[PDB]
């Protein structure tokens, strides 16, 4: 449809030009709604053509902004939903069992309703992820604890606000320079009565010796349990590992991406050097190369626990969750 096409182009341009849905949950919701509209409006005779068109718009969406993995995650979730619905309606993972024991394009005229119902169920599950994560705050925070945060994470903010109803603790927030969004987080936490401290990134390793545990958010969870987080999270994780401080990642399930850390030089988001070195410096900007990476790679061995809407897991289990969310044939997309 023309309206569907204009909505797709609006989404693509919003992704390309930055901004858009500030919260990752909002953009996941928008991606799911767009995918539902594409499924409804477009004409597809069978499951294979629907798969091909979903993959085509998913490729365009991912090429719009590769650093935002949520869109590709939702596209792959919809593809896996289509796979499971078609398999359940028509017929009856690579393992040793399958290897020892050992097709689409058959039209059924009943798959669309099941696909839409599954997408709606996914949307309802997506709506309550933050409350589900926050409900586990008291199991991980004790009396007079010291928590450490970097930047502004809405899930971690909800976590701490829910924990603060019954326990008293201290929170140290490190500003995520240059976009010092930790100031907003510290002000918001102080509004709720939690005693809070503002400090720079350079002080992280200076104060980790007096921190009990580190609770952080992330942008992406990779297939091996690695993280794409805000820049400065890798050094914070290294400092926590130096002191054996437990590092907890509060991240919903829709931030799990089936790719591997093999990709390089496009992982980080490089933005204008104005954030690091102002334009008013003058002539020295001619011969100075200044880079401003927005994201950081965190190896899985630096993460102690993952708290999601389904509970707590170790990084070593992340692979299984991957196999429970995405088909291996959709990793390349």
């Amino acid at each position: 449809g023309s309206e569907l096409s204009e909505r797709i182009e609006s989404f693509v341009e919003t992704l390309k030009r930055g901004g858009g849905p500030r919260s990752s949950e909002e953009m996941a919701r928008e991606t799911l709604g767009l995918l539902r509209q594409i499924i409804t409006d477009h004409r597809w005779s069978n499951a294979g053509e629907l798969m091909e068109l979903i993959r085509r718009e998913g490729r365009r969406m991912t090429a719009a902004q590769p650093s935002e993995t949520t869109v590709g995650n939702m596209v792959r979730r919809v593809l896996k939903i289509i796979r499971e619905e078609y398999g359940r309606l028509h017929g009856r993972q690579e393992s040793l069992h399958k290897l020892l024991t050992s097709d689409f394009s058959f039209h059924y005229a009943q798959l669309q309703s099941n696909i839409i119902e599954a997408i709606n169920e996914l949307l309802v599950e997506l709506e309550g992820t933050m409350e589900n994560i926050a409900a586990q705050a008291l199991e991980h925070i004790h009396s007079n604890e010291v928590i450490m945060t970097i930047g502004f994470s809405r899930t971690v903010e909800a976590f701490l606000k829910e924990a603060a109803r019954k326990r008293k603790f201290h929170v140290i927030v490190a500003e995520c320079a240059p976009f010092c969004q930790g100031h907003e987080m510290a002000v918001n936490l102080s509004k709720a009565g939690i005693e809070t401290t503002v400090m720079t990134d350079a002080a992280i390793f200076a104060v980790m010796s007096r921190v009990n545990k580190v609770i952080i958010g992330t942008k992406t969870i990779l297939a091996n349990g690695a993280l794409r987080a805000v820049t400065g999270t890798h050094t914070l994780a290294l400092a926590a590992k130096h002191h054996s401080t437990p590092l907890i990642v509060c991240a919903p399930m829709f931030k799990l991406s089936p790719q591997f850390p093999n990709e390089e030089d496009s992982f980080h988001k490089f933005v204008a050097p104005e954030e690091v070195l102002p334009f008013t410096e003058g002539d020295i900007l001619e011969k100075v190369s200044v880079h401003c990476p927005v994201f950081d790679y965190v190896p899985p061995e630096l993460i102690t626990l993952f708290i999601s809407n389904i509970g707590g897991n170790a990084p070593s289990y992340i692979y299984r969750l991957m196999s429970e969310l995405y088909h291996p044939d959709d990793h390349v997309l």
């Binding site: 393992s95 069992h97 290897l99 020892l100 024991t101 091996n224 349990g225 591997f260 992340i318």
Partner: protein
């Protein structure tokens, strides 16, 4: 058939195709034994297959042959569970074995295609000894028009590292040969380590040539990623607590010169198998899924 011609078939099939691995040849020999058995009972078939696996593992002391034998026994047990009647079971086992043979043949190309992406342009690659899967990975990488250097170790008990260096020079890839005592010296030059495996133990560690453990320890000490390429038919439910806990049938006959050692899963970054790229914790799950 008979023990003599069983061993002869094993050796001849290994000889006629020097590319095919020992485990693949053992599985093919066991499938050929199954084809011509003239038996009527699944109990006698199981006993005779166990005896044939014992003979084959007596011919050569490799972990991969025993792993393939256990996998074959599990395959037979699963097929027997599916079909009660032996006459119907036999044909199903034969066709399933043919498909299994084709899949384990394609495993090497699957591993190479999946693994070649982790090595960059200008990267320095460290290998330990001769490994056909590592060679396939490097061939796929150079086919992808990537430029990199490779270091190999001489692998003193049998200079198979020199064989690997010759095979790599045959394709004109820049390679270097270092002593078995130079690994710790050369680790800082390299960016990642790629080794093969003769067998993957239950907890995610690996069994491989005697120099693998020290290379893994050095890579961990200098924070270098340690990658292992291994086929799925090398999964064994063995749990070595230490080096001495490794069965002696795999150390010797394959002052004191063991042929293999064991590497713990904590020293391994990722494993590249025909099932995909796995964490060491996945392997155990696989085994737990296979044996109910």
């Amino acid at each position: 058939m008979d023990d003599k011609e069983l061993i002869e078939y094993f050796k001849s099939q290994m000889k006629e195709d020097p590319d095919m691995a020992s485990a693949v040849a053992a599985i093919r020999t066991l499938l050929e034994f199954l084809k011509r058995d003239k038996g009527e009972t699944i109990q006698g078939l199981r006993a005779n297959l166990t005896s044939a696996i014992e003979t084959l593992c007596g011919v050569d002391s490799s972990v991969a042959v025993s792993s393939g034998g256990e996998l074959f026994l599990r395959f037979i047990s699963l097929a027997s569970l599916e079909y009660s009647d032996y006459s119907k079971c036999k044909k199903i086992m034969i066709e399933r074995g043919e498909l299994f043979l084709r899949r384990i043949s394609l495993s090497r190309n699957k591993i190479a295609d999946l693994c070649h992406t982790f090595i960059k342009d200008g990267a320095t690659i460290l290998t330990h000894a001769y490994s056909r899967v590592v060679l396939r990975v490097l061939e796929a990488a150079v086919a992808a028009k990537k430029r990199f250097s490779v270091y190999v170790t001489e692998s003193q008990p049998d200079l198979s590292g020199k064989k690997m260096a010759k095979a790599l020079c045959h394709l004109n890839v820049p390679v270097t040969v270092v002593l078995d005592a130079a690994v710790g010296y050369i680790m800082e030059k390299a960016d990642l380590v790629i080794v093969g495996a003769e067998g993957v133990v239950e907890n995610g560690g690996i069994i491989n040539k005697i120099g693998t453990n020290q290379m893994a320890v050095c890579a961990k000490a200098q924070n270098k990623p340690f990658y292992v390429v291994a086929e799925s038919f090398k999964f064994v439910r063995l749990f070595p607590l230490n080096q001495q806990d490794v069965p002696d049938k795999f150390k010797y006959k394959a002052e004191e010169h063991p042929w293999v050692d064991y590497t713990a899963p904590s020293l391994i970054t990722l494993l590249f198998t025909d099932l995909g790229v796995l964490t060491p914790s996945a392997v155990s799950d696989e085994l737990i899924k296979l044996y109910l």
